[PDB]
Design a protein around this ligand. Structure first.
Ligand SMILES: CC(C)(COP(=O)(O)OP(=O)(O)OC[C@H]1O[C@@H](n2cnc3c(N)ncnc32)[C@H](O)[C@@H]1OP(=O)(O)O)[C@@H](O)C(=O)NCCC(=O)NCCNC(=O)Cc1cc(O)cc(O)c1
Ligand SMILES: CC(C)(COP(=O)(O)OP(=O)(O)OC[C@H]1O[C@@H](n2cnc3c(N)ncnc32)[C@H](O)[C@@H]1OP(=O)(O)O)[C@@H](O)C(=O)NCCC(=O)NCCNC(=O)Cc1cc(O)cc(O)c1
Ligand SMILES: CC(C)(COP(=O)(O)OP(=O)(O)OC[C@H]1O[C@@H](n2cnc3c(N)ncnc32)[C@H](O)[C@@H]1OP(=O)(O)O)[C@@H](O)C(=O)NCCC(=O)NCCNC(=O)Cc1cc(O)cc(O)c1
Lengths: 422, 422, 421, 140
């Protein structure tokens, strides 16, 4: 119509023709590498140009003019079948997923371009964000059993209702709560259950006792993303990096968007609750990022917080969005641009942590904190605070650039090389 | 679309239940649940109606945004032009004659209304401009104030001296506890200070108290009058919304005048710098006021708190402004957990520019007043306030605040706590 | 409609009064009040006209936002296409030959114009993109800079070394006091640093001074040239607005290039990280620069001030950015009351990452340059700057600033103070 | 205040400094003993800071927090004259005289001062003729 779809289709065909005829990734000459790299670039450039003008119409076809909420995975899958060449097919992703990161063609980058244009739209963006705030099907499935038993054991998370508290314990005892696609699914499911359970008033996130010999008997909050899986090709742009930000982490802030099925929905369409985080040992990378959204943060006297991948790492989620608010532009750049580690007992830890407690008094201090966040006053006040701290436009515009910026970093040679050495 | 008719019907059901059911407090649980469901259905339709019709409703009331109406006039004109949308003057009179525990909560409808009005990018800014205009009372008193340099009001004493508008809050029997009359006096005094060409700088300070526990001691503010709040005499519109959109916003942005002087084309509002001096303490609404001044001095023995963390209403615009001053951790410590901050602790410097011993405070106040005189200050504080708080940011917050605060004003926890004071 | 005719009417009255009345300073009180009233009526109509017509005015000048024009070209094309809206080149030359105290203040009309342009959600972002594009001067000098690794300019020395673009401000006789030429050199150097593929990180430092009170000592910046400001040589457009929308904004957002390289579809601007090293002091415009760098070092004896709290012009975008660094109390202490902040006091850490003894300063500057190399920094500092300062936030501020600063540039208190320096 | 001048500050009842001032006993590598600083500095700054200053030549700036170990008031150049004058009026009475006598007696015993100055007389004499000192001082 303006020719952009036809040009994209053409440029995608050239890519598929080079991938069919050229040797495997590791066997390509420099001229072959430069040729496919140029074809990828031409195709992706046209993905951007097409969506610059057609994003809203593309989204409208997929969601019936914003009348059906689709989560990220369903959205990019429906976009692949309805707009071939715009984003990779399930089959193309499975081929990618079976390769180590160093050998991938980087088809996820197209999903970054796509989600970029979707989140930039003032119509499509807020709708997709609402879609990710709704309860996961898995949580709705497990909710009756959780109301009954007060307990759910998941692969990466243990959830227990006790004294009105949703106790989320991250329990990957062999690898220091290193994050993966399954951890995100469990965290979101647990986060959904806590919010939907009327017997839960406050949530608590803590790391469990580790079993690895260097930490045996010691709790550890988070060692951040699983670098082994990232090297091996198992960290999904959509199902890990974007899902965690638009899903459970955003629900910690804004709650779960429910159906119009209860009183008061006209004033509170989302159910939100206050959250307490307790940091044992350390919070690193993705785990440090989580602390920027809790209502109360406690840490053991020996803990530290870092976003360590300053030279050859991916973007630390929404830390770049939120850290300036906590620490100011100098400290946030010291932390992110230069990898400054902040210790629980140094004065600037009070920018990130409310309470630092000696190991032998921490359990009791955690329990006291849980009783202080009970009321309706807290619910109203933290809603107004989060609204002031982080506007819908601010979050949307950031996650918009993040979708593409992070996709590129996930395929950067410096990242692949570093992660390979872990 | 049928929404007006559905609302009219649902409001009829409410009025019929109120006519037939027994008085508040004599109702059974089935009767209480029935009227609660009727209120909920009507209010849900108030929201839906205004979601699509707010701009047209506002246009009828203001002649397509060509007549500026203040809050009281707006909600009163909306009641007569759109029966059932917001309560009539007579329905409000009945409510106002009841203790808060017995009210049906018709003000909540005004919260719904003002929320939708402020959410409109067309209706919202016009209403905010209307509240920035000088009050009729101030225009009335302006000539005598220019002549005399003095006005004695019930809750405020205003004196022009050395180019300073000295506002002294002088409710000496109740620690300057706030009520509807205090707001009217404060706005009148702020209006006079800004309109008076003999005033260059404003000063807000608490007067000498006469209550036995504080006799001979100045006190800044003990916050909202909790007795009146329990008794039903705190108005959502004429107190909680009026102070935020009126005098407090005028401290930031000045008074919007007519096109009646040179330079109006670059400065349609008259703004001046303000100094606050805190004796004894600043609590609740009085603490909120400090987030808006150009200079804040405090006595060495003063403290600052927003104390109603468990069972209180939202602390005005503190939830909007405190994060900017103290960051997300300290602002939640203060608001979510009621942390009190003392003038001599290091973190008081987040809220206070100067902490001075009682016997050197008067002179330090006078010195501070001479430092804010020029045209440079005027331009710089205009640019600073513009950067600190965008029009959209303030509007969007006050929109949600209008409804969120209305709900809190009728919350059972609030009513119960407030009943127990004094 | 009718606003253009009324404006044309009011501008004619002004021109006819300026033709018949005596020179500025020879005017009586009645004559001064008459021309002041005429200026006021004309400027009021400039605002009212542009309130409704800004976008069409801009569309005529830029071919419906299809041609990028820089500030100087924009206001000059507006002068030729809409006579009386903004001053002509000839009217500006007359103004430029007068001391500030004698000017009619025709720049104020440009402030009105740029305010209305930047306020438009269509015209504003377009003008901002135009100022992010490389200056022609820089494109001209780029091939020799790639070859030689060195450019000597009047106010700036630029050297590529070890992948670092070393900008040394080298006005050794006046403590690097700023003027129109310094801005042109700074933007040219910043452009070169960003366009040069051999540069990975930029460094801004003050050079060794030659004035007797500072001989042999480096000094970062003494702020705007107050002598030139008194004499009428500080241009609203070519200095005060140019520096904010050009080289200072390029430090944040990079240079907008043509679609001429791989990856432009994700990175249409080339940005790089910047280090600032403050010797002696950073004052006024020089202190403003520090709110925009990725790393800031200072010598133990340095201080930072925005000193003109009583009788000064607005300190550029400090009013926009300082609150983010220091909070609303400190930022008002600095700007409203002229509080000076010393490198060794605790709150210096709000503005400065590292404070170092003079004898160890060169070495930590060098260490800092090696820490900002990767692709990780580039991605992270883009996301940080995006979170820190939204396009709307910057645009809306610079819109009001265009007029607010124009008025301050002609304020009697400013002219008087600056005359005494 | 450098060397002998910084030493003097350990003996005053009130010390004011301009915001741009610094205090050092700089000759840590090749200098003579800084008078009675080794006797008095520990009392003001503790054993860690006094060794940082004396053993390692740490320079202390008027605006850093630890300057308050040595200085009572740090004032901007344009307000310093007036701040000096105010300080002079606050030390007038007979009460100050009695109190500063009792303080100095508690702070520095006769035996302590004497025992230090006894060893100092010889230790400093040796340093005054040390080859490192002579060499370093020749290069100034
Ligand atoms: C914490 C440590 C210093 C501890 O070191 P030691 O005390 O020497 O213990 P180790 O033996 O390394 O750890 C014990 C155990 O855990 C394993 N371990 C520890 N951390 C990890 C991670 N992060 N991944 C995988 N495996 C891990 C380690 O391999 C050992 O297992 P075996 O090899 O089977 O023995 C170390 O584990 C470490 O440096 N880990 C890497 C930390 C790191 O760089 N994490 C990633 C940071 N970056 C992100 O999170 C990026 C991110 C995450 C997100 O969620 C979102 C987003 O947008 C971006
Ligand atoms: C400050 C105090 C601790 C002083 O304690 P004491 O030294 O024991 O003094 P008291 O004898 O109680 O005070 C003296 C005197 O003032 C009366 N007093 C003090 N504060 C009040 C208030 N707020 N209301 C009514 N009466 C009051 C107190 O009842 C005594 O009167 P008598 O009965 O005549 O003796 C105490 O008075 C107190 O707790 N006061 C109330 C504090 C409080 O929680 N105030 C409300 C805070 N919440 C808001 O402002 C909420 C708000 C305000 C807004 O403006 C806008 C908005 O959106 C939200
Ligand atoms: C820095 C100083 C304290 C140093 O004082 P001393 O140590 O006593 O040295 P001086 O002998 O005064 O300085 C040596 C030398 O530099 C010259 N010098 C120093 N500062 C200046 C300035 N600002 N202009 C011109 N010449 C200067 C001074 O005139 C001497 O020249 P000669 O007399 O010809 O020898 C002093 O020079 C001073 O007070 N300077 C003025 C500081 C000032 O107000 N600067 C401007 C502040 N305002 C802005 O930056 C405004 C601004 C700038 C922008 O870029 C953007 C914007 O929006 C707003």
């Amino acid at each position: 119509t303006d020719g952009l779809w036809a040009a994209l289709t053409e440029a995608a065909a050239s890519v598929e023709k080079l991938l069919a005829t050229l040797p495997e990734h590791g066997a390509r000459s420099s001229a072959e590498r430069a040729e496919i790299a140029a074809a990828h670039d031409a195709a992706r450039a046209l993905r951007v140009r097409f969506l610059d003008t057609h994003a809203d119409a593309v989204y409208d076809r997929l969601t019936d003019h914003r009348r059906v909420h689709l989560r990220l995975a369903e959205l990019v899958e429906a976009a692949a079948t309805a707009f071939p060449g715009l984003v990779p097919t399930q089959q193309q992703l499975a081929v990618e997923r079976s390769l180590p990161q160093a050998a991938k063609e980087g088809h996820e980058i197209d999903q970054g371009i796509f989600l970029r244009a979707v989140l930039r739209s003032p119509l499509a963006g807020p709708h997709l964000l609402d879609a990710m705030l709704r309860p996961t099907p898995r949580a709705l499935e497990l909710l009756p059993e959780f109301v009954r038993t007060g307990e759910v054991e998941m692969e990466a998370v243990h959830l227990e209702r006790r004294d009105g508290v949703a106790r989320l314990t991250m329990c990957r005892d062999d690898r220091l709560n290193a994050e993966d696609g399954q951890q995100v699914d469990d965290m979101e499911t647990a986060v959904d259950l806590a919010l939907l359970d009327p017997g839960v008033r406050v949530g608590l996130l803590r790391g469990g006792v580790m079993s690895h010999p260097r930490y045996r008997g010691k709790r550890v909050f988070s060692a951040g993303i699983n670098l082994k899986y990232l090297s091996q090709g198992g960290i999904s742009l959509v199902d890990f990096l974007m899902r965690r930000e638009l899903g459970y982490i955003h629900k910690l802030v804004r709650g779960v968007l429910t159906n119009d099925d209860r009183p008061g929905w006209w004033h509170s369409p989302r159910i939100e609750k206050p959250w307490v985080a307790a940091v044992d040992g350390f919070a690193i990378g993705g785990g440090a990022q989580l602390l920027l959204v809790f209502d109360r943060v406690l840490a053991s006297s020996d803990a530290y917080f870092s976003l360590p991948a300053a030279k050859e790492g991916i973007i630390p989620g929404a830390a770049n969005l939120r850290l300036g608010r906590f620490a100011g532009p100098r400290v946030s750049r010291q932390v992110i641009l230069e990898g400054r580690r902040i210790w629980a007992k140094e004065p600037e830890a009070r920018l990130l942590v409310d309470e630092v407690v000696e190991p032998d008094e921490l359990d009791a201090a955690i329990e006291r904190s849980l009783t202080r966040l009970d009321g309706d006053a807290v619910l109203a006040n933290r809603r107004m605070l989060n609204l002031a701290d982080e506007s819908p436009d601010g979050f949307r515009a950031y996650m918009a650039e993040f979708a593409l910026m992070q996709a590129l970093r996930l395929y950067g040679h410096d990242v692949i090389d570093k992660v390979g050495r872990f």
